[PDB]
Amino acid sequence: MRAKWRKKRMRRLKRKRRKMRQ
Amino acid sequence: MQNDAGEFVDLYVPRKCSASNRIIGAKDHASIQMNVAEVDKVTGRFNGQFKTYAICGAIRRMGESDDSILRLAKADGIVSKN
Amino acid sequence: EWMPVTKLGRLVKDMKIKSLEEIYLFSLPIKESEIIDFFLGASLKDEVLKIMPVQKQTRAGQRTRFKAFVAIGDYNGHVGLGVKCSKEVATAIRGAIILAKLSIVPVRRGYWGNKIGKPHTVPCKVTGRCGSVLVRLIPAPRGTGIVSAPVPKKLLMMAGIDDCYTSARGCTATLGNFAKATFDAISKTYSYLTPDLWKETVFTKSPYQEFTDHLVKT
Amino acid sequence: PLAKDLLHPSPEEEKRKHKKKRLVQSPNSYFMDVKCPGCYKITTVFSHAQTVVLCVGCSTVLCQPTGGKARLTEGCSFRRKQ
Amino acid sequence: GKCRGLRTARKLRSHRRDQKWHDKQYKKAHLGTALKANPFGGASHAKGIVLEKVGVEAKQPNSAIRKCVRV
Amino acid sequence: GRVRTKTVKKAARVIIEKYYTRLGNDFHTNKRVCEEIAIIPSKKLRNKIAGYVTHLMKRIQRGPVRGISIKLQEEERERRDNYVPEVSALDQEIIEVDPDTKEMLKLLDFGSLSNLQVTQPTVGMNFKTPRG
Amino acid sequence: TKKRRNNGRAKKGRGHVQPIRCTNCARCVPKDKAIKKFVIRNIVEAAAVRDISEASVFDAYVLPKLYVKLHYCVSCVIHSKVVRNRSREARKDRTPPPR
Amino acid sequence: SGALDVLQMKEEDVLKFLAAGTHLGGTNLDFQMEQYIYKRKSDGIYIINLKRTWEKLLLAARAIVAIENPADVSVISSRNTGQRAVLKFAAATGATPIAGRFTPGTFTNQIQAAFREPRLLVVTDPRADHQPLTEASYVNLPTIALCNTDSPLRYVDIAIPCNNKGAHSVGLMWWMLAREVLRMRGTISREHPWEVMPDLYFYRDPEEIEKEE
Amino acid sequence: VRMNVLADALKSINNAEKRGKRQVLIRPCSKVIVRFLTVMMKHGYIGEFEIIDDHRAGKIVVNLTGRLNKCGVISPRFDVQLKDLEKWQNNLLPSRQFGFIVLTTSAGIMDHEEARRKHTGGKILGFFF
RNA sequence: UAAAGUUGCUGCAGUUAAAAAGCUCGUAGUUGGAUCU
RNA sequence: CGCAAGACGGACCAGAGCGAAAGCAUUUGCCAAGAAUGUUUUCAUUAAUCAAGAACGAAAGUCGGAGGUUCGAAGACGAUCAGAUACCGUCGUAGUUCCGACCAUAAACGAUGCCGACCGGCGAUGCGGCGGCGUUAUUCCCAUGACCCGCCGGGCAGCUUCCGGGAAACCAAAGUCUUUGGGUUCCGGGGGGAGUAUGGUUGCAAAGCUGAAACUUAAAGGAAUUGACGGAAGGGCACCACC
């Protein structure tokens, strides 16, 4: 996987994780 | 080269460059030993004797072998002063 | 027998070069191993350090040749190292022996402390380098032996160095570079200007000049 | 070169160098006595003067400041000392 | 380059102490996290009760069944 | 193609260098002499060698060729190497000399010479090729 | 590994160079890096020169030329064969083709 | 020279030098040839000091004479300008000439037909005879060269400052080297002019030989 | 900026000796530089030198005999005791037959052999061999 | 623990192998030109 | 033929200049700044590097207010494809522009900290100064401007390198290194897990900074050498190729 796209996927994971955590 | 008993223990005494006073190595095949013929003061003919200048390969490569030989000849009266 | 091909070989065969140190003194290159066979003769002890098979990729497959690393030298101040690559091991060994004979250099021995007896160690600290392999030789006290890896130990024993300290850095696992760095450090011993060599050089006649009449009389 | 003498350099080779890079540094500037038709007194003017120098005996400017040496007006005789 | 001053002892000491934590063996042996994760707890041996026998398959380049026990 | 290989080329060169006396310009005579003075083991190769010998004879009848060193052309060339003029080309009554070389000769202790004519130096310092 | 000492561009002593557009693809390519061709071509092609000359109202008209500056990205300049790949040694030759 | 009156340069030598244009160098100056030039003209040409030229020629003659076997001196000229001069020098002096292409490995490849091991090496142009000069650094071979103002001095041990471009200057330089070598040896004296004139060494191009005959 | 003018002087001498030059110009001069050069010259390594007097800080032109392999400075100037001198010589000198460590002691600037003769330790200035 | 000059004070490395902060000011820290018998 | 809008500033434009970097190109005016050069001016160690702190910081992005030509994420269609909702084409929304407030990240690169010495050569080029034959322009008495040939200082570069160094590629620095110490800051320690989790901290948000471990692995990787391959180029060849 391209490193930029790996970072984008990780950032989307973090966005969902911070969405679920309040 | 000399032990405490005074005996010489070197295999041989290597030549030193006549310009840089650095040792010329046994495998320095770019080094030269030029003989410059000596000449009679009134006839200008070969005397059978000469003067030897040893120039290492490092000086030859950097191009100052000519100037070194010129200075060695000047400082010896083979080449006229000025 | 041996028909010399060079002027130096002709001078050596006709018994007018007294020692191998004259050629070293005048820095002449040796192109015939028979000169070394004539001067050092039976005192030379060679051994094969390594046989490295090297392959070249081709369309049909890999072309394999064998490189022989050979160290030679009488255990009295002369050492050489020769590397030859051939299609066969025996030919490579013969070529490497010839090359090691041709590469023999004089080794300068010195003293660690008091100058009693024959010189036993290196005259000073010398360093040899060959492709990231740095070999440092340090003068050692009498009776120390060679404190070194097996390859530098073999080269130093062949050079006649009784006892020495050694340091190595870099990929010494590549035997060729390790051996070449040791050889470089060993050959640097006579290139080092020590205060006992400050005495002004007194030039003698070159073998080519002193025996020019014999060379032209043929 | 490999044997160029630094203790006794040629005078042209020292005037060639930068004033600070010489064996002993020395300025490239000097002072001049400039005579004006409108006066008689002594007016010593720095060669690299940064000021507008005016002759007290007339309405005539002596020199004008410049990026380097001052520009002496036409009709004034200047003698350099030292 | 590194600092070479007569009064640089504190800087050299602190830099070495901070850079030692980038050594894998040093961090493993001094952080204490690998010690709590060690089943033996720093011991050379341990005694256990055999729960079952298991055969683990060898890694890919060679084929075998390694006779192990879960203790 | 009709490219002659090294065999016929080298054989022709040697035959011409060694027996330039007998060879001529005719193919038939060159064929006969080539058969006589050489052991050519094939007749096709003999004919090819004779043909290239004829071609090279035409070549050398019009000047010197580098592959062959016949004795007559070498003698002519060496005779040309010894040609010496009646008066030396350096024996000029007047030698034109620039002012700077005259000053050098003055510093050279040769300033009294009357062969030297001082020429006007070129007032243009335009001696370098324009850049671009 | 560094292929070129100048990094394939002609930028020394500055940070940013304004981009231009490749004449073929409209790629944004820096002006220093772009391959520039200055084409000075006759408006009338050499085949049509004689026919246009005869139909000319004015004798000795000397027809005008076309001045078009061409900017190329590396991809389009290589594909169009304006530049070619060269050996590691011949790459250093900056002399324009003698033509 | 050694400041001897016998070895001083005469008016005839200066006449020959000026007629051949030996004092005229090029527009470029090698930084190791600066000590041999005198000034730069208004047209950019560097003037070669003929005192230094005579000094270096006499030094080269001494070096050649010191070689006991004349055949051990090798004279080289790849350019046609110095070729005939090199053959004439070898004929008069006894040196071994190499006129034309210098085969690489001549000094280093012992298994080779044209293998020679000279004790001295003289070239017409260091820039044009760079191959023998490079090989002389493999066999401890000292080198004498005829060097212009822009000539490189690597591996050159005695550089004779002279115009090595013009045919007249090259021929005169080789002729004077041969004359001085012979005079230092003893054959031919310096009290009367040498019987061989300098034009025997000059290069003649095909146009010139056709015109003359 | 330029600190430790002795380091600059010794580096210039070393670089000029590597290049094979006969003279080196050192600037600025200093008392410690002159003392180090004098210690070098007493042992025959460097030969005569001349101090050019410009009215701010001298320059020195040093003749160079080809005898010098390396001259170096030790920074910082560690205080060396007579019992730690042997370790310094083993670290710095090529052998026990030649080579000198130059110390600065209350008895002056001298080599390690003299410092042991006078029974003084000091501060290490440099070395030369 | 040595080997490990793979923790480098002696004594490592930082263009491409891991690596010089995007850049510049800046306090503490570290270092600091000649010159006195 | 005009009119109106925003955007941009072609060619000139360069291995040219300026700026700390990001970056900077239509004219003119104003405002403050700056390097270098010149200096026989002044002060007289006032300096170098820098934890903590601080200013600036492409693009994209965020919040307000204008503007909204062109291009254009998203989106809507049309297209040879086995399959685009990809590449191509027609439109097109946020954006792209300006004014405030944030954001502080780039292959932010010379993948090369800064200050200071020494170490080859050559030809240019930008700026300042100095010297000099001659050629050109303002009434015929001179500077000066444009050329020409040089020297000095700083600068952007073009260099062998057997000075030297490197694993080499290559580098006059990436040299002056086992012959190892000029000063100082930051920073790496096999590959993954991972710039992840967590804590803290900044932010409206997007996210930024600091930043593990369990576990897993014998290699990953750098330079180069030969071959093989290329829907890579150049030049040739074959009716087991084609025409």
Swiss-Prot record, chain C:
What are the S5 DRBM domain coordinates in residue numbering? 44-107
Q: Which UniProt keywords apply?
A: Acetylation, Citrullination, Cytoplasm, Isopeptide bond, Nucleus, Phosphoprotein, Repeat, Ribonucleoprotein, Ribosomal protein, Ubl conjugation
Q: Report the PTM annotation.
A: Citrullinated by PADI4 in the Arg/Gly-rich region.
Q: Where in this protein does the record say N6-acetyllysine is found?
A: K205, K217
Ribonucleoprotein in keyword set: yes
Record's keyword annotation contains Ubl conjugation: yes
Name one molecular function that GO assigns to this entry.
Answer: mRNA binding
* Assembly and oligomerization: Component of the small ribosomal subunit. Interacts with zinc finger protein ZNF277 (via zinc-finger domains); the interaction is direct; the interaction is extra-ribosomal. Interaction with ZNF277 competes with the binding of RPS2 to protein arginine methyltransferase PRMT3.
UniProt name for this protein:
Small ribosomal subunit protein uS5
Origin species, per record, is Homo sapiens (Human)
Q: Where the shown chain sits in the full protein?
A: 59 to 276 of 293
From Swiss-Prot, chain D:
Q: Which residues bind Zn(2+)?
A: C36, C39, C55, C58
Q: Name one GO molecular function term.
A: DNA binding
- Keywords per UniProt: Cytoplasm, Diamond-Blackfan anemia, Metal-binding, Nucleus, Phosphoprotein, Ribonucleoprotein, Ribosomal protein, Zinc, Zinc-finger
Q: Name one GO cellular component term.
A: glutamatergic synapse
InterPro entries per UniProt: Ribosomal_eS27 (IPR000592), Ribosomal_eS27_Zn-bd_dom_sf (IPR023407), Ribosomal_zn-bd (IPR011332)
Cofactor: how and how many bound: Binds 1 zinc ion per subunit.
Expression across tissues: Expressed in a wide variety of actively proliferating cells and tumor tissues.
**Cofactors that this protein relies on:** Zn(2+)
Where is this chain's protein located in or outside the cell? Cytoplasm; Nucleus, Nucleolus
Q: Where is this region: Disordered?
A: 1-22
GO BP, sorted A to Z: cytoplasmic translation; ribosomal small subunit assembly; ribosomal small subunit biogenesis; rRNA processing; translation
The segments annotated as C4-type zinc fingers are 36-58
The question of whether Metal-binding is a record keyword is answered with: yes
Enumerate composition-biased segments (Basic and acidic residues).
1-15
Q: Phosphoserine: which positions carry it?
A: S10
> Tied to what disorder?
Diamond-Blackfan anemia 17: A form of Diamond-Blackfan anemia, a congenital non-regenerative hypoplastic anemia that usually presents early in infancy. Diamond-Blackfan anemia is characterized by a moderate to severe macrocytic anemia, erythroblastopenia, and an increased risk of malignancy. 30 to 40% of Diamond-Blackfan anemia patients present with short stature and congenital anomalies, the most frequent being craniofacial (Pierre-Robin syndrome and cleft palate), thumb and urogenital anomalies.
Summary of subunit composition and partner proteins:
Component of the small ribosomal subunit. Part of the small subunit (SSU) processome, composed of more than 70 proteins and the RNA chaperone small nucleolar RNA (snoRNA) U3.
Q: Gene name, please?
A: RPS27
UniProtKB/Swiss-Prot annotation, chain F:
Identify one Pfam family in the record: Ribosomal_S17e
Q: Which residues carry this modification: N6-succinyllysine?
A: K18
Q: Alphabetically list the UniProt keywords.
A: Cytoplasm, Diamond-Blackfan anemia, Isopeptide bond, Nucleus, Phosphoprotein, Ribonucleoprotein, Ribosomal protein, Ubl conjugation
Q: Where is this cross-link: Glycyl lysine isopeptide (Lys-Gly) (interchain with G-Cter in SUMO1)?
A: K102
Q: Please, one GO biological process term?
A: ribosomal small subunit biogenesis
Residues the record lists as Phosphoserine modifications: S112
Keyword Ribosomal protein listed? The answer is yes
Q: Where in the cell is it found?
A: Cytoplasm; Nucleus, Nucleolus
Among PROSITE patterns, the record links this protein to: RIBOSOMAL_S17E
Task: Decide whether keyword Magnesium is in the record.
Answer: no
Q: Which residues carry this modification: Phosphothreonine?
A: T129
Domain of life, source organism: Eukaryota
Q: Which InterPro entries match?
A: Ribosomal_eS17, Ribosomal_eS17_CS, Ribosomal_eS17_sf
- Glycyl lysine isopeptide (Lys-Gly) (interchain with G-Cter in SUMO2), cross-linked positions: K102
GO molecular function list: RNA binding; structural constituent of ribosome
The UniProt function text for this chain reads: Component of the small ribosomal subunit. The ribosome is a large ribonucleoprotein complex responsible for the synthesis of proteins in the cell. Part of the small subunit (SSU) processome, first precursor of the small eukaryotic ribosomal subunit. During the assembly of the SSU processome in the nucleolus, many ribosome biogenesis factors, an RNA chaperone and ribosomal proteins associate with the nascent pre-rRNA and work in concert to generate RNA folding, modifications, rearrangements and cleavage as well as targeted degradation of pre-ribosomal RNA by the RNA exosome.
- Subunit details: Component of the small ribosomal subunit. Part of the small subunit (SSU) processome, composed of more than 70 proteins and the RNA chaperone small nucleolar RNA (snoRNA) U3.
Q: What is this protein called?
A: Small ribosomal subunit protein eS17
Q: Which gene encodes it?
A: RPS17
Swiss-Prot record, chain I:
Q: Which InterPro entries match?
A: Ribosomal_uS8, Ribosomal_uS8_CS, Ribosomal_uS8_sf
- Note whether Phosphoprotein occurs among the keywords: no
Task: Name its cellular compartments.
Answer: Cytoplasm; Nucleus, Nucleolus
**The organism's place on the tree of life at top rank:** Eukaryota
Q: Which biological process terms from the Gene Ontology are attached to this UniProt entry?
A: cytoplasmic translation; positive regulation of cell cycle; positive regulation of cell population proliferation; response to virus; ribosomal small subunit biogenesis; translation
Keyword annotations for this protein, in alphabetical order, are:
Cytoplasm, Diamond-Blackfan anemia, Nucleus, Ribonucleoprotein, Ribosomal protein
Query: Single GO cellular component annotation?
Result: cytosol
Q: Does the keyword ATP-binding apply?
A: no
| Location of N6-succinyllysine modifications | K87
User: What is an example of a GO molecular function annotated in this UniProt entry?
Assistant: RNA binding
- Its family? Belongs to the universal ribosomal protein uS8 family.
Q: Which NCBIfam families match?
A: PRK04034.1 (NF003115)
- Quaternary form? Component of the 40S ribosomal subunit. Part of the small subunit (SSU) processome, composed of more than 70 proteins and the RNA chaperone small nucleolar RNA (snoRNA) U3.
Q: Provide the disease association from the record.
A: Diamond-Blackfan anemia 20: A form of Diamond-Blackfan anemia, a congenital non-regenerative hypoplastic anemia that usually presents early in infancy. Diamond-Blackfan anemia is characterized by a moderate to severe macrocytic anemia, erythroblastopenia, and an increased risk of malignancy. 30 to 40% of Diamond-Blackfan anemia patients present with short stature and congenital anomalies, the most frequent being craniofacial (Pierre-Robin syndrome and cleft palate), thumb and urogenital anomalies. DBA20 inheritance is autosomal dominant.
Protein name (Swiss-Prot/TrEMBL)? Small ribosomal subunit protein uS8
User: From which source organism is this entry?
Assistant: Homo sapiens (Human)
